Design an enzyme around this catalytic site. Structure first.
Site, PDB file in Angstrom:
ATOM      1  N   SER A   1       8.176  -6.291 -13.008  1.00 24.45           N
ATOM      2  CA  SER A   1       8.121  -4.883 -12.620  1.00 24.45           C
ATOM      3  C   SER A   1       7.722  -4.574 -11.185  1.00 24.45           C
ATOM      4  CB  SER A   1       7.202  -4.105 -13.569  1.00 24.45           C
ATOM      5  OG  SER A   1       7.937  -3.203 -14.368  1.00 24.45           O
TER       6      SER A   1
ATOM      7  N   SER B   1       6.737   3.147 -14.814  1.00 26.04           N
ATOM      8  CA  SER B   1       7.674   2.017 -14.733  1.00 26.04           C
ATOM      9  C   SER B   1       8.786   2.065 -15.779  1.00 26.04           C
ATOM     10  CB  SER B   1       6.951   0.672 -14.864  1.00 26.04           C
ATOM     11  OG  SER B   1       6.124   0.490 -13.726  1.00 26.04           O
TER      12      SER B   1
ATOM     13  N   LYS C   1      10.003  -2.871  -8.955  1.00 25.79           N
ATOM     14  CA  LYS C   1      10.122  -1.409  -8.836  1.00 25.79           C
ATOM     15  C   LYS C   1       9.503  -0.836  -7.566  1.00 25.79           C
ATOM     16  CE  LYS C   1      10.511  -0.532 -13.778  1.00 25.79           C
ATOM     17  NZ  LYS C   1      10.340  -1.941 -14.282  1.00 25.79           N
TER      18      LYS C   1
END
Length: 345
Positions: free
Chosen positions: A36, A102, A39
């Site tokens: 993640s 997220s 991101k």
């Protein structure tokens, strides 16, 4: 020297935002899954689009079948806002979904809206990765979900984090938000350090790989100073936050950032040959800040090599013509021309 703290993780780095100085590091160039943390780049690109006014916060985006577990099996089991094909959703809302929640579907919906498809958006992601010097980073997805050849490093994550803060600060600003509300449900920021009483932490992103562990890119401020830490592959959630806390705390306690050469200051003046001006101001530009152990400012003084012993026109603003090196009773940066000098006529 100040002895660097022990860190219980696969890889880590601690970096001063203003000087770029790496205060502590372990395996900081090892290629690892960013998961993640990908991101952060997604947001960087969305940030650039907003800053360029190619998209607006109030623009409504139509969610495609790719942005929905039903229509994209890749989203099954991952964090999502729960979007459905045909939904109309704010850029601002999908942007908060990426940043605070997220949401992997928000990533896709906004990628299509910005770039027309995921593959084009991933192209912008890698383009900026190359631009920002992320020499060990390759993105293969807009959301960071598992893909074959997708990697980054602690060092590259700190460089990217510094870029987000510096280049798209309005987008950085959103990463400290503890919640936002979508479809009448409040969605929490999983960055637990936003709640620390021991630090003023304002970013940036958490992540958990397939089976390396728990990742955090954090940034904090204390007085005029800002540090970025990255901790990659900790064994537990607790350790991920705790080792990140330990680094930021150590950097602020023992170091200070000073700026002996301001941007727009002249460090040396030099004769220039055959130009329309007989001399040129040379400086550090924006890279004149240095991170030093606290109390050492007294003992610090600056130097340079002129390369070419002889400056000849044309010279271009920003053109690098040598080297500043910093000295403690330490660090090196370009010595740059601060104004254009054309050839004489």
């Amino acid at each position: 020297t100040v002895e660097a703290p022990s860190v219980d993780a696969r890889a880590w780095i601690l970096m001063d935002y203003a000087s770029g100085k790496v205060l502590a590091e372990g395996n900081a160039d090892e290629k690892l899954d960013p998961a993640s943390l990908t991101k952060i780049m997604t947001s960087y690109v969305v940030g650039q689009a907003l800053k360029a006014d190619k998209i607006k916060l109030t623009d409504m985006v139509t969610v495609g079948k790719d942005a929905w577990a039903t229509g994209n099996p890749a989203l099954r089991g991952s964090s999502v806002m729960f979007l459905k094909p045909g939904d109309q959703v704010s850029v601002a809302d999908l942007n908060k979904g990426v940043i605070i929640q997220s949401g992997n579907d928000a990533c896709i919906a906004l990628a299509d809206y910005v770039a027309g498809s995921q593959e084009s958006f991933i192209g912008l992601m890698n383009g900026y990765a190359k631009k920002l010097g992320l020499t060990n980073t390759t993105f293969q997805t807009v959301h960071g979900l598992d893909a074959p050849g997708q990697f980054s490093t602690a060092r590259d994550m700190a460089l990217l984090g510094k870029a987000l803060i510096h280049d798209v600060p309005e987008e950085y600003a959103i990463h400290k938000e503890k919640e936002f509300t979508f479809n009448k449900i409040r969605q929490p920021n999983r960055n637990r350090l936003l709640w620390s009483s021991n630090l003023n932490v304002d970013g940036m992103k958490t992540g958990t790989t397939a089976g390396a562990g728990y990742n955090l890119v954090a940034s904090a401020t204390q007085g005029d100073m800002r540090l970025i830490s990255v901790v990659l592959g900790a064994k537990t959630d607790r350790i991920r936050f705790n080792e990140s806390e330990k680094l930021l705390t150590w950097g602020f306690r023992f170091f200070e950032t000073v700026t002996p050469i301001k941007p727009d200051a002249t460090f040396v003046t030099q004769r220039v040959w055959f130009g329309d001006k007989s001399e040129v101001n040379l400086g550090a530009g924006e890279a004149g800040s240095v991170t030093i152990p606290r109390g050492q400012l007294k003992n610090l003084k600056a130097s340079y090599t002129l390369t070419e012993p002889q400056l000849t026109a044309p010279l271009k603003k920003g053109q690098v013509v040598g080297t500043i090196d910093f000295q403690l009773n330490i660090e090196q940066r370009p010595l740059i021309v601060m104004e254009n000098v054309e050839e004489g006529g």
